[PDB]
CSV table of C-alpha atoms in Angstrom, one decimal:
chain,number,residue,atom,x,y,z
A,2,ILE,CA,0.0,0.0,0.0
A,3,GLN,CA,1.7,3.1,-1.2
A,4,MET,CA,1.1,6.7,-0.2
A,5,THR,CA,1.3,9.4,-2.9
A,6,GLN,CA,1.9,12.8,-1.4
A,7,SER,CA,1.5,16.1,-3.1
A,8,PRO,CA,2.9,18.7,-3.5
A,9,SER,CA,6.5,17.9,-2.9
A,10,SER,CA,7.0,21.5,-1.8
A,11,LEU,CA,5.1,24.7,-1.3
A,12,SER,CA,5.9,28.2,-0.1
A,13,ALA,CA,3.4,30.1,2.1
A,14,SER,CA,3.0,33.1,4.4
A,15,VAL,CA,2.2,33.3,8.1
A,16,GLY,CA,-1.6,33.2,8.3
A,17,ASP,CA,-2.2,31.2,5.2
A,18,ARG,CA,-4.4,28.1,4.9
A,19,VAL,CA,-2.2,25.2,3.8
A,20,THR,CA,-3.4,22.0,2.2
A,21,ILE,CA,-1.3,18.8,1.9
A,22,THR,CA,-2.8,15.7,0.3
A,23,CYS,CA,-2.0,12.0,0.4
A,24,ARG,CA,-3.6,9.3,-1.8
A,25,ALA,CA,-3.5,5.6,-0.7
A,26,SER,CA,-3.2,3.0,-3.4
A,27,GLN,CA,-5.9,1.0,-1.7
A,28,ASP,CA,-8.5,1.4,1.0
A,29,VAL,CA,-6.8,2.0,4.4
A,30,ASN,CA,-9.9,2.9,6.4
A,31,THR,CA,-8.9,5.7,8.8
A,32,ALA,CA,-5.5,4.1,9.6
A,33,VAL,CA,-3.5,7.2,8.6
A,34,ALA,CA,-1.2,9.4,10.6
A,35,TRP,CA,0.5,12.7,9.7
A,36,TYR,CA,4.0,13.6,11.0
A,37,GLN,CA,6.1,16.8,11.1
A,38,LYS,CA,9.9,16.6,10.6
A,39,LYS,CA,12.5,19.3,11.0
A,40,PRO,CA,16.2,18.9,9.9
A,41,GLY,CA,18.2,16.9,12.3
A,42,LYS,CA,15.1,16.4,14.5
A,43,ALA,CA,12.9,13.4,15.3
A,44,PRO,CA,9.5,13.1,13.6
A,45,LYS,CA,6.6,14.4,15.6
A,46,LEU,CA,3.1,12.9,15.5
A,47,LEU,CA,0.4,15.5,14.5
A,48,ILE,CA,-2.7,13.6,13.5
A,49,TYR,CA,-3.7,10.0,14.2
A,50,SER,CA,-6.5,7.9,12.8
A,51,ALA,CA,-7.0,10.4,9.9
A,52,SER,CA,-8.7,13.2,11.9
A,53,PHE,CA,-7.7,13.2,15.6
A,54,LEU,CA,-5.4,15.8,17.0
A,55,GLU,CA,-2.4,14.5,19.0
A,56,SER,CA,-2.4,16.0,22.6
A,57,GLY,CA,-0.3,19.1,22.7
A,58,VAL,CA,-0.5,19.7,19.0
A,59,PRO,CA,-2.0,23.2,18.2
A,60,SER,CA,-5.6,23.4,17.1
A,61,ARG,CA,-4.7,24.9,13.7
A,62,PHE,CA,-3.8,21.3,12.6
A,63,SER,CA,-6.5,19.1,11.3
A,64,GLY,CA,-6.9,16.0,9.1
A,65,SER,CA,-9.7,14.7,6.9
A,66,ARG,CA,-10.5,11.6,4.9
A,67,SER,CA,-12.4,11.1,1.7
A,68,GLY,CA,-12.2,7.6,0.5
A,69,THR,CA,-8.6,6.8,-0.4
A,70,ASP,CA,-7.6,10.5,-0.1
A,71,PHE,CA,-6.2,12.1,3.1
A,72,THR,CA,-5.8,15.8,3.7
A,73,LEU,CA,-3.7,17.6,6.2
A,74,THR,CA,-4.8,21.2,6.7
A,75,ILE,CA,-3.1,24.0,8.6
A,76,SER,CA,-5.7,26.6,9.1
A,77,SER,CA,-3.4,29.5,9.9
A,78,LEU,CA,0.3,28.9,9.3
A,79,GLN,CA,2.5,29.9,12.2
A,80,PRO,CA,6.3,30.6,12.2
A,81,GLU,CA,7.1,27.3,13.9
A,82,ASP,CA,5.2,25.4,11.2
A,83,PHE,CA,7.8,25.6,8.5
A,84,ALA,CA,9.0,22.0,8.1
A,85,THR,CA,8.5,18.8,6.1
A,86,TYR,CA,5.3,16.8,6.6
A,87,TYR,CA,4.7,13.1,6.0
A,88,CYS,CA,1.6,10.9,5.7
A,89,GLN,CA,1.7,7.3,6.8
A,90,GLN,CA,-0.7,4.4,6.5
A,91,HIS,CA,-0.6,1.7,9.2
A,92,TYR,CA,-3.6,-0.3,7.9
A,93,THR,CA,-1.3,-3.2,7.0
A,94,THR,CA,2.3,-4.4,7.4
A,95,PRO,CA,4.5,-2.8,6.3
A,96,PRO,CA,3.4,0.7,7.4
A,97,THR,CA,4.4,3.0,4.6
A,98,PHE,CA,5.1,6.7,4.2
A,99,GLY,CA,4.5,9.4,1.6
A,100,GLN,CA,7.5,11.1,0.1
A,101,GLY,CA,6.9,14.2,2.1
A,102,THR,CA,5.9,17.8,1.6
A,103,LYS,CA,8.4,20.6,2.4
A,104,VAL,CA,6.7,23.8,3.6
A,105,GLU,CA,8.9,26.9,3.1
A,106,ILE,CA,8.3,30.6,3.9
A,107,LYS,CA,7.5,33.1,1.1
A,108,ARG,CA,9.3,36.4,1.3
A,109,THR,CA,10.3,39.3,-1.0
A,110,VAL,CA,12.8,38.9,-3.8
A,111,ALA,CA,16.3,39.5,-2.7
A,112,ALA,CA,19.3,39.7,-5.1
A,113,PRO,CA,22.3,37.6,-4.1
A,114,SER,CA,25.6,39.2,-3.2
A,115,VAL,CA,28.3,37.4,-5.2
A,116,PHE,CA,31.9,36.6,-4.2
A,117,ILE,CA,34.7,34.7,-6.0
A,118,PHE,CA,37.8,33.1,-4.4
A,119,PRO,CA,41.0,31.8,-6.0
A,120,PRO,CA,42.5,28.6,-4.7
A,121,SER,CA,44.7,29.2,-1.7
A,122,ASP,CA,48.5,29.1,-2.1
A,123,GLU,CA,48.3,26.2,0.4
A,124,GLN,CA,46.0,24.1,-1.7
A,125,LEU,CA,48.0,24.9,-4.8
A,126,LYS,CA,51.1,23.8,-3.1
A,127,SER,CA,49.4,20.5,-2.2
A,128,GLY,CA,48.8,20.0,-5.9
A,129,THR,CA,45.1,20.8,-6.5
A,130,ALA,CA,43.0,23.9,-7.3
A,131,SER,CA,39.4,24.6,-6.0
A,132,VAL,CA,37.9,27.9,-7.4
A,133,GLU,CA,35.0,29.1,-5.2
A,134,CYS,CA,31.9,31.1,-5.9
A,135,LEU,CA,29.5,32.3,-3.3
A,136,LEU,CA,25.9,33.6,-3.8
A,137,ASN,CA,24.9,35.0,-0.5
A,138,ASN,CA,21.4,35.6,0.9
A,139,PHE,CA,19.0,35.5,-2.0
A,140,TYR,CA,15.4,34.6,-2.7
A,141,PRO,CA,13.8,32.7,-4.4
A,142,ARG,CA,15.9,29.6,-4.5
A,143,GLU,CA,16.2,29.4,-8.3
A,144,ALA,CA,19.6,30.7,-9.4
A,145,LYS,CA,22.1,29.9,-12.1
A,146,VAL,CA,25.9,29.9,-11.8
A,147,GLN,CA,27.9,30.0,-15.0
A,148,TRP,CA,31.7,29.5,-14.7
A,149,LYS,CA,33.9,31.0,-17.4
A,150,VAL,CA,37.7,30.6,-17.9
A,151,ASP,CA,39.2,33.2,-20.2
A,152,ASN,CA,35.6,33.8,-21.3
A,153,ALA,CA,35.2,30.2,-22.2
A,154,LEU,CA,31.9,28.8,-20.8
A,155,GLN,CA,32.5,25.8,-18.4
A,156,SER,CA,30.3,22.8,-18.1
A,157,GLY,CA,30.8,19.5,-16.2
A,158,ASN,CA,33.6,20.4,-13.8
A,159,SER,CA,31.6,22.2,-11.0
A,160,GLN,CA,29.6,21.1,-8.0
A,161,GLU,CA,27.3,23.2,-5.9
A,162,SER,CA,25.1,23.0,-2.8
A,163,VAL,CA,22.5,25.2,-1.2
A,164,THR,CA,21.6,26.1,2.4
A,165,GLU,CA,18.1,25.7,3.8
A,166,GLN,CA,16.2,28.9,4.4
A,167,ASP,CA,17.9,31.2,6.9
A,168,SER,CA,16.2,31.4,10.3
A,169,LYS,CA,16.4,35.2,10.4
A,170,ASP,CA,15.8,36.5,6.9
A,171,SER,CA,14.4,33.4,5.1
A,172,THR,CA,17.0,33.6,2.2
A,173,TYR,CA,19.1,30.9,0.6
A,174,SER,CA,22.8,30.9,-0.1
A,175,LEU,CA,24.7,28.9,-2.7
A,176,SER,CA,28.3,27.7,-2.9
A,177,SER,CA,29.9,26.4,-6.1
A,178,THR,CA,33.3,24.8,-6.6
A,179,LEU,CA,35.0,24.8,-10.0
A,180,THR,CA,37.6,21.9,-9.8
A,181,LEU,CA,40.7,22.0,-11.9
A,182,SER,CA,44.1,20.2,-11.7
A,183,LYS,CA,46.9,22.6,-10.7
A,184,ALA,CA,48.3,22.1,-14.2
A,185,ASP,CA,45.1,23.1,-16.0
A,186,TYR,CA,44.5,26.0,-13.6
A,187,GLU,CA,47.8,27.5,-14.5
A,188,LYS,CA,47.1,27.4,-18.2
A,189,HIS,CA,44.5,30.2,-17.9
A,190,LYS,CA,44.3,33.7,-16.6
A,191,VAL,CA,40.8,35.1,-15.9
A,192,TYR,CA,38.4,33.1,-13.8
A,193,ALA,CA,34.8,34.3,-13.6
A,194,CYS,CA,31.6,33.4,-11.9
A,195,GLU,CA,28.5,34.8,-13.7
A,196,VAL,CA,25.2,34.8,-11.7
A,197,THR,CA,21.6,35.0,-13.0
A,198,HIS,CA,18.8,35.6,-10.6
A,199,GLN,CA,15.3,37.2,-10.5
A,200,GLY,CA,16.6,40.0,-8.2
A,201,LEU,CA,19.3,41.0,-10.7
A,202,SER,CA,18.3,43.3,-13.6
A,203,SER,CA,21.0,41.6,-15.7
A,204,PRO,CA,23.6,38.9,-14.8
A,205,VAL,CA,26.4,39.8,-12.4
A,206,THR,CA,30.0,38.6,-12.9
A,207,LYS,CA,32.7,38.4,-10.3
A,208,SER,CA,36.2,37.5,-11.5
A,209,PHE,CA,39.9,37.4,-10.6
A,210,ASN,CA,43.2,37.3,-12.4
A,211,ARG,CA,45.2,34.2,-11.6
A,212,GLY,CA,48.1,35.2,-9.3
A,213,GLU,CA,47.0,38.7,-8.5
A,214,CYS,CA,47.2,39.6,-4.8
B,1,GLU,CA,8.0,12.4,29.9
B,2,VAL,CA,8.5,9.7,27.3
B,3,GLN,CA,12.0,9.3,25.8
B,4,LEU,CA,13.6,7.0,23.3
B,5,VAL,CA,17.4,7.1,22.8
B,6,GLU,CA,19.2,5.3,20.0
B,7,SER,CA,22.9,4.2,20.1
B,8,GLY,CA,25.3,2.0,18.3
B,9,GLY,CA,25.6,3.6,14.9
B,10,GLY,CA,28.8,4.0,13.1
B,11,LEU,CA,30.9,3.2,10.0
B,12,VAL,CA,31.0,-0.4,8.9
B,13,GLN,CA,32.2,-2.5,6.0
B,14,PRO,CA,29.7,-4.1,3.5
B,15,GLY,CA,29.0,-7.6,4.6
B,16,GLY,CA,29.6,-6.7,8.2
B,17,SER,CA,27.4,-6.5,11.3
B,18,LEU,CA,26.3,-3.8,13.7
B,19,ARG,CA,23.9,-3.8,16.7
B,20,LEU,CA,21.8,-0.8,17.5
B,21,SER,CA,20.1,-0.1,20.8
B,22,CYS,CA,16.9,1.8,21.7
B,23,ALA,CA,16.7,2.8,25.4
B,24,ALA,CA,13.2,3.7,26.6
B,25,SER,CA,12.4,6.1,29.5
B,26,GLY,CA,9.1,7.3,30.9
B,27,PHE,CA,7.2,4.2,29.9
B,28,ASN,CA,7.6,0.4,29.9
B,29,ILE,CA,8.3,-1.3,26.5
B,30,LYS,CA,6.3,-4.3,27.8
B,31,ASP,CA,3.2,-2.1,27.1
B,32,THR,CA,3.9,-1.3,23.5
B,33,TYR,CA,5.3,-2.1,20.1
B,34,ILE,CA,8.8,-0.9,19.3
B,35,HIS,CA,9.8,-0.1,15.7
B,36,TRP,CA,12.8,0.8,13.7
B,37,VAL,CA,12.4,3.2,10.8
B,38,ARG,CA,15.2,4.5,8.7
B,39,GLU,CA,15.9,7.5,6.4
B,40,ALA,CA,18.3,6.9,3.6
B,41,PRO,CA,19.6,9.8,1.4
B,42,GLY,CA,16.7,10.8,-0.8
B,43,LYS,CA,14.6,7.7,-0.1
B,44,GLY,CA,12.2,9.2,2.5
B,45,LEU,CA,11.2,7.2,5.6
B,46,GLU,CA,11.2,3.4,5.4
B,47,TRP,CA,9.9,1.1,8.1
B,48,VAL,CA,12.4,-1.6,9.0
B,49,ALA,CA,10.9,-3.9,11.7
B,50,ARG,CA,8.8,-4.1,14.8
B,51,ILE,CA,8.6,-6.1,18.0
B,52,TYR,CA,6.1,-6.7,20.8
B,53,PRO,CA,8.4,-7.1,23.8
B,54,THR,CA,5.8,-8.9,25.9
B,55,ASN,CA,5.8,-12.0,23.6
B,56,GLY,CA,8.7,-11.3,21.4
B,57,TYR,CA,6.7,-11.4,18.2
B,58,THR,CA,8.4,-9.7,15.3
B,59,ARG,CA,7.8,-8.3,11.8
B,60,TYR,CA,10.3,-7.2,9.1
B,61,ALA,CA,10.4,-5.3,5.8
B,62,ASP,CA,11.1,-7.7,2.9
B,63,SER,CA,14.4,-5.9,2.2
B,64,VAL,CA,15.9,-6.8,5.6
B,65,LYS,CA,14.2,-10.2,6.4
B,66,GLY,CA,16.7,-12.9,7.4
B,67,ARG,CA,19.7,-10.7,7.8
B,68,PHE,CA,18.3,-8.3,10.4
B,69,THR,CA,16.9,-9.3,13.8
B,70,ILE,CA,14.9,-7.0,16.1
B,71,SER,CA,14.9,-8.0,19.8
B,72,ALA,CA,14.1,-6.6,23.2
B,73,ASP,CA,15.0,-7.0,26.9
B,74,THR,CA,12.1,-5.9,29.1
B,75,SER,CA,14.3,-6.0,32.2
B,76,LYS,CA,16.5,-3.3,30.6
B,77,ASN,CA,13.6,-1.5,29.0
B,78,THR,CA,15.7,-1.6,25.8
B,79,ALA,CA,15.2,-2.9,22.2
B,80,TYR,CA,17.8,-3.8,19.7
B,81,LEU,CA,18.4,-4.1,16.0
B,82,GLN,CA,21.0,-6.6,15.0
B,83,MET,CA,22.1,-5.8,11.4
B,84,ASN,CA,24.0,-8.4,9.4
B,85,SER,CA,25.2,-8.8,5.8
B,86,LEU,CA,25.1,-5.0,5.6
B,87,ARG,CA,24.8,-3.3,2.2
B,88,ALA,CA,25.5,0.2,1.0
B,89,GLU,CA,21.7,0.6,0.6
B,90,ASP,CA,21.4,0.2,4.4
B,91,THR,CA,23.2,3.5,4.9
B,92,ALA,CA,20.7,5.6,6.7
B,93,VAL,CA,19.7,7.4,9.9
B,94,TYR,CA,18.0,4.8,12.1
B,95,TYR,CA,15.2,5.8,14.4
B,96,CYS,CA,13.3,3.8,16.9
B,97,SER,CA,9.7,4.6,17.7
B,98,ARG,CA,6.8,3.2,19.7
B,99,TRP,CA,3.1,2.6,19.1
B,106,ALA,CA,0.3,5.9,15.4
B,107,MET,CA,3.9,6.4,16.3
B,108,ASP,CA,3.6,9.0,19.0
B,109,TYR,CA,7.3,9.1,20.1
B,110,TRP,CA,10.6,8.8,18.2
B,111,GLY,CA,14.2,9.0,19.2
B,112,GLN,CA,16.8,11.4,17.7
B,113,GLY,CA,18.2,8.7,15.4
B,114,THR,CA,21.7,7.2,15.0
B,115,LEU,CA,23.7,7.3,11.7
B,116,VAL,CA,24.8,4.0,10.1
B,117,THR,CA,27.3,4.3,7.2
B,118,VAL,CA,28.1,1.1,5.2
B,119,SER,CA,31.2,1.6,3.1
B,120,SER,CA,34.5,-0.1,2.3
B,121,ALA,CA,36.3,3.3,2.4
B,122,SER,CA,38.6,4.2,5.2
B,123,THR,CA,38.2,7.1,7.6
B,124,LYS,CA,40.1,10.2,6.4
B,125,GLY,CA,40.4,13.6,8.1
B,126,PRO,CA,39.9,16.8,6.1
B,127,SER,CA,42.5,19.3,4.8
B,128,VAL,CA,41.3,22.8,5.6
B,129,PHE,CA,42.1,25.7,3.3
B,130,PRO,CA,41.3,29.4,3.7
B,131,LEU,CA,39.0,31.3,1.4
B,132,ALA,CA,40.7,34.7,1.9
B,133,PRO,CA,38.7,37.9,1.6
B,134,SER,CA,39.3,39.6,-1.7
B,135,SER,CA,41.8,42.5,-2.0
B,136,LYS,CA,39.2,44.3,-4.0
B,137,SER,CA,36.7,44.1,-1.1
B,138,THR,CA,34.5,47.3,-1.1
B,139,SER,CA,35.9,49.6,1.6
B,140,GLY,CA,33.4,50.4,4.3
B,141,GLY,CA,31.2,47.7,2.8
B,142,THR,CA,30.8,43.9,3.2
B,143,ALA,CA,33.5,41.2,2.7
B,144,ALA,CA,33.2,37.5,2.5
B,145,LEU,CA,35.7,34.9,3.7
B,146,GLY,CA,35.6,31.2,4.5
B,147,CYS,CA,37.1,27.8,4.8
B,148,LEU,CA,37.2,24.8,2.4
B,149,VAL,CA,37.0,21.5,4.3
B,150,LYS,CA,38.3,19.1,1.7
B,151,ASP,CA,38.7,15.3,1.2
B,152,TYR,CA,37.2,13.7,4.2
B,153,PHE,CA,35.2,10.5,4.9
B,154,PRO,CA,32.7,9.8,6.3
B,155,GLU,CA,30.3,12.6,7.2
B,156,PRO,CA,29.7,14.5,9.3
B,157,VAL,CA,31.9,17.5,10.0
B,158,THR,CA,31.1,20.6,12.0
B,159,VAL,CA,32.4,24.1,11.6
B,160,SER,CA,32.4,27.1,13.9
B,161,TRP,CA,34.0,30.5,13.7
B,162,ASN,CA,36.2,32.1,16.3
B,163,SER,CA,35.5,29.3,18.8
B,164,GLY,CA,31.8,30.1,18.6
B,165,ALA,CA,32.0,33.8,19.2
B,166,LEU,CA,31.1,34.6,15.5
B,167,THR,CA,27.7,33.3,14.4
B,168,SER,CA,25.9,36.1,12.5
B,169,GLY,CA,26.4,35.9,8.8
B,170,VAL,CA,27.8,32.3,8.9
B,171,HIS,CA,26.7,29.8,6.2
B,172,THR,CA,28.0,26.3,6.5
B,173,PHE,CA,26.9,24.4,3.3
B,174,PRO,CA,25.8,20.8,2.7
B,175,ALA,CA,28.8,18.6,1.9
B,176,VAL,CA,29.3,17.5,-1.7
B,177,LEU,CA,30.5,14.1,-2.7
B,178,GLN,CA,33.5,14.3,-5.0
B,179,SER,CA,34.3,11.9,-7.8
B,180,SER,CA,37.0,10.5,-5.5
B,181,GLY,CA,34.4,9.3,-3.1
B,182,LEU,CA,35.5,11.9,-0.5
B,183,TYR,CA,33.5,14.8,0.8
B,184,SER,CA,34.2,18.5,0.3
B,185,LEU,CA,32.3,21.3,2.1
B,186,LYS,CA,32.4,25.1,2.5
B,187,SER,CA,31.8,27.4,5.4
B,188,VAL,CA,31.6,31.1,4.8
B,189,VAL,CA,30.9,34.3,6.7
B,190,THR,CA,30.3,37.9,5.7
B,191,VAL,CA,31.9,40.6,7.8
B,192,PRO,CA,32.5,44.3,7.5
B,193,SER,CA,35.4,45.3,5.2
B,194,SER,CA,36.7,47.7,7.8
B,195,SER,CA,37.5,44.7,10.1
B,196,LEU,CA,39.7,42.7,7.7
B,197,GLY,CA,43.0,44.3,8.9
B,198,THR,CA,42.1,44.4,12.6
B,199,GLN,CA,40.1,41.2,13.5
B,200,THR,CA,41.2,37.6,13.4
B,201,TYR,CA,38.9,35.1,11.7
B,202,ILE,CA,39.5,31.4,12.5
B,203,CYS,CA,37.4,28.5,11.4
B,204,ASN,CA,37.2,25.6,13.8
B,205,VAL,CA,36.7,22.3,12.1
B,206,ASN,CA,35.8,19.1,13.8
B,207,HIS,CA,35.7,15.7,12.1
B,208,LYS,CA,34.7,13.4,14.9
B,209,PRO,CA,34.8,10.1,12.8
B,210,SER,CA,38.6,10.6,12.4
B,211,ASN,CA,39.2,12.5,15.6
B,212,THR,CA,40.4,15.5,13.7
B,213,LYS,CA,40.2,19.1,15.0
B,214,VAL,CA,41.7,21.8,12.9
B,215,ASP,CA,41.7,25.6,13.6
B,216,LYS,CA,42.6,27.6,10.5
B,217,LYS,CA,43.2,31.3,10.5
B,218,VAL,CA,41.8,33.0,7.4
B,219,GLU,CA,43.9,36.1,6.6
B,220,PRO,CA,43.5,38.8,3.9
């Protein structure tokens, strides 16, 4: 018995009515629970037997059943409610979980501040070169980093990762590494990170000249 | 107050064995079902097994039947998950819970890999010489080539927290992790303040303090 949960993510504002749905592949009566999960934290039970509020859980949480479909509603979204939510059926063994719904906070557009860093002399001495680009405190999450080396567009040799929404200003930050052997790094002069984002009227480029203090 | 506390996780070779424990407080496990549930990278939550400690009856997920054994000792108010013939696919955070599942523990990390522990090298991301005067500068640390996760980073022994972003690690082609930690600070502080990133990689007992200089 599988649980098909939608949407996978949503953004909402404090005070909004939020709706998360879960479809069971078969009848599961009312044997459905909803859980809240925050990063690095244990899941927390919200709703049991489709519609019953777990003691201590705020009244703004409720659950409903219509046939094979289960709905979690948050009547008025509060600051502490931003998290991932999971449905679970326990009608039969094994109990199974939906893939989860990540609830994020909506805010205003914020342009990223962009920074570029050469590989340190230390790392170069060790024989490798990591070129770094940072996109700091932007919103929304969607952003594109384009690496250029002597104005040649790079593809295939970078890796990036992104923080979760900041606890104070609700932005994201992105970190990208362009990886090159020391030999290849020293074959080129100008290293550039070009950033495209909704908050920027046109793409921003930060660059350095290899070797320049 | 009900509590569940998992222990016993760590780094183990494929084909190996590891025993997890789940210590219960604030209730008696004789009165409930105890479960193990795991969370593998990008696989969501997956139920693993359950036991009724009163009669020792067990149930297992098909993917672990035979090679895992769940057990309990009511006199210790503790349940166990004996994991054998471990596979890479078993790498996960393992939680125990009780019967809906109204209480869960914090989880314990199990990593199944043939790769050895390796401590990170730490390199500075020095603030640009073209930093805008009177404005904002960025600097950071590159924590490179370690295994397994996790690593932690603080700045100035914890005294610097505002403007810090420590990013999710990335897995390199080598099979080793790389991560970045950055902080934005005022430009006017670059020649007068010391910035040190404090890196801890507990799996290899590595602590490194790296000064990041302009």
